Structure 1
């Protein structure tokens, strides 16, 4: 089996804390730019538990590495977001020894599109970050 470093609960947390600290405007002003993203809550089987997780972070990674993301978030907090997403991914994926991941991804496309629509706006960006944070929390009820 795979045993994460004792300090991985500490890793998944630091992502949430960053996603928090990246907040730019008052989520009030954006209650108009809201949207149900239809997250696949039903998810959250140890092997699955890891796939779904690795499934998600890489996506969170992919979504916040964008040319555009770099233009709506202070760069410092991007780099540490990215550093702690890679380090989580890296030793999770080290366990490559031996609907599902697909619902997760259609889900993430929505977010990719929903933005293109709302035209990479300030509020559009909050909505996402915030949304991501929820989903991550939910995700994070897996230890």
Structure 2
């Protein structure tokens, strides 16, 4: 497995997700009352493979967030579909590339980093559910996901040596 192809692949693709996200509805306002407490780990340097596991986890959960109802925002559903497409493709890619590590990924799925990543998305989803998928909540989440994309680009530094 080579981390150089992967590194540039992810940088490019996550670039496209940012832009697609930005086309959704005006400027991203990073300063809202909400704090979902992004896990400290997402900024720590970690083993190259674990990094790939973490990015995969993030991308799969971000696909889950956009699976929800967003009619309240009046966003063009064709742009969300394109975001969902880009995220799906990266997932498929990482799922194949990381194949020789299936069993290690399975054990990592129960590590402290994985459990913190998951509870973080539980919170993001639960916030949307509690706010009844209203447009304000979606504006808050869009901005948070934007932050996830910024952190995903950061994680790709771990793929270089």
TM over 0.5: yes
Q: What root-mean-square deviation, in Å, do the aligned CA atoms of Structure 1 and Structure 2 show? A: 2.4
Residue 82 (structure 1) aligned to one of 78, 81, 84: 84
Does the alignment pair 1:139 with 2:152? yes
Residue 48 (structure 2) aligned to one of 40, 46, 54: 46
8 Å CA contact retained: 2:42, 2:155: no
**Cα gap change, 1:116 to 1:26, in 2 (>3 Å):** same
Deviation at 1:39, TM superposition (A): 0.4
**Cα gap change, 1:123 to 1:25, in 2 (>3 Å):** farther
**Cα gap change, 1:25 to 1:116, in 2 (>3 Å):** farther
8 Å CA contact retained: 1:18, 1:77: yes
Residue 100 (structure 2) aligned to one of 86, 97, 101: 97
Structure having the higher helix fraction is 2
Residue 61 (structure 1) aligned to one of 51, 60, 63: 63
**Cα gap change, 1:84 to 1:120, in 2 (>3 Å):** same
TM-score by length of 1: 0.84
SS at structure 1 position matched to 2:100: coil
Total equivalences in the alignment: 139
Unaligned runs of at least 5 residues, structure 2: 102-111, 157-161
Unaligned runs of at least 5 residues, structure 1: none
Deviation at 1:96, TM superposition (A): 1.8
Deviation at 1:70, TM superposition (A): 5.5
8 Å CA contact retained: 1:39, 1:107: yes
Residue 106 (structure 1) aligned to one of 100, 119, 125: 119
Does the alignment pair 1:121 with 2:121? no
